[PDB]
Amino acid sequence: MLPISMSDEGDSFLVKDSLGENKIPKNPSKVVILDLGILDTFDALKLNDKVVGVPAKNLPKYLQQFKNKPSVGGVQQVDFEAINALKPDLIIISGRQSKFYDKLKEIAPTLFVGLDNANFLSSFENNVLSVAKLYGLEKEALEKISDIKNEIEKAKSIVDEDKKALIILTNSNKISAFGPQSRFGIIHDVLGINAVDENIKVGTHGKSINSEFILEKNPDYIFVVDRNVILGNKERAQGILDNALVAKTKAAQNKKIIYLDPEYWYLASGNGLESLKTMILEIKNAVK
Ligand SMILES: O=C(NCCCC[C@H](NC(=O)c1cccc(O)c1O)C(=O)O)c1cccc(O)c1O
Ligand SMILES: [Fe+3]
């Protein structure tokens, strides 16, 4: 994935990313943000007053300080009319809104801050730094990035080299599996937790598996992202995994089936200076 590149043009930057090119003014004061992790970053960089629109339909519990910003809909149900009515000077999007890119760029310059699943930390840093550059806050952003590296090192320090993990997403009653370099890859790729299968095929919403597969892998840890919650259905991962196949795995026997908070993992707030920290601690605390 091409990183964000930025050239200083006096009162604006000429900015290039994976989706195209924009002239972005310095210090934009009317920013519509559709990536929840970058919204968390605005908070951490003390830029809350710059924000004028947020996806209130998908606003997590840890981002309720933005509850009174004007809504621009949800991460998937982008309210174009609301965005146009706000007359923003910058729109910030990630992978869920690439399909809306031309429509959004005609309203205002549109910055892409997608996380590269093959290069998580590199893309995270480039996203946070590129926002911080717009406001002259590179120093503060560097010191926060450095804190996150220290959390990563504390986390990696307690990881048991000989235990193995399987990441699953549950949707309806269906299970799908994710591996290294996936949208949840940071468990394997950044935090160094080994995988039951390093060779799982990457593909947005996953690799279809069943409880037999889980038992055959016999993971020490099962990390579960229950997409039922973000979609709103009845069926819990805890119910689907209450079977005697899964019951025999080392993870079930050691109570190391971990239900990760989907508002972080699924909504993918890994761009957040505080929300990424939270995610690292959540893994550390489950495996220490
Ligand atoms: O382009 C994406 N999805 C388009 C198809 C989704 C259609 C539809 N999705 C949702 O209802 C949905 C709602 C909120 C957040 C989501 O990630 C959703 O997939 C479904 O239920 O299958 C996408 C991109 C990056 C990451 C994702 O999770 C995506 O869903
Ligand atoms: Fe999705």
- Nearest-CA residue for ligand 1 atom 4 is 96
* 4 and 100, same domain (yes or no): yes
* 24 and 61, same domain (yes or no): yes
* 166 and 128, same domain (yes or no): no
* 134 and 172, same domain (yes or no): no
Ligand 1 pocket check: which of 19, 57, 76, 172 to mutate, most ligand atoms within 8 Å of Cβ? Answer: 76
CA dist 275 and 37 (Å) reads: 7
Residues 6+ apart with CB under 8 A from 13: 6, 7, 23, 24, 26, 133, 134
- Range 63-91 burial, b when 16+ CB lie within 10 A, else e: beebeebbbbbebeebbeeebeebebbbb
Contact, 211 vs 246, CB < 8 A?
yes
Residue type, 263: E
Residue type, 52: V
* 183 and 144, same domain (yes or no): no
- Structure tokens given for 200: 């799982």
State if residue 75 touches ligand 1 by the CB under 6 angstroms criterion: yes
Domain total in the chain: 2
CA dist 178 and 184 (Å) reads: 7
CA dist 15 and 23 (Å) reads: 6
CA 68 to chain centre: 23
- Nearest-CA residue for ligand 1 atom 25 is 96
- Nearest-CA residue for ligand 1 atom 2 is 96
State if residue 145 touches ligand 1 by the CB under 6 angstroms criterion: no
* 138 and 235, same domain (yes or no): no
* 192 and 60, same domain (yes or no): no
The continuous run of DSSP H or E covering 43 comes out as helix 36-44
Residue 53's domain comprises 1-158+261-288
* 13 and 96, same domain (yes or no): yes
Contact, 77 vs 99, CB < 8 A?
no
* 117 and 24, same domain (yes or no): yes
Resolution (Å units): 1.8
Elucidated via: X-ray
Looking at residue 173, which CATH number applies to its domain? 3.40.50.1980
* 59 and 16, same domain (yes or no): yes
The continuous run of DSSP H or E covering 159 comes out as none
* 107 and 7, same domain (yes or no): yes
CA dist 180 and 186 (Å) reads: 7
Q: CA geometry: angle at 263 spanning 54 and 280, to 5°? A: 115
Residue closest to 265 by CA, chosen among 257, 276, 274, 256: 276
* 76 and 173, same domain (yes or no): no
User: Could you tell me whether strands 51-53 and 31-33 are parallel, antiparallel, or unpaired per DSSP bridges?
Assistant: parallel
* Spacing, Cα 205 to ligand 2 middle (Å): 7
- Nearest-CA residue for ligand 1 atom 1 is 96
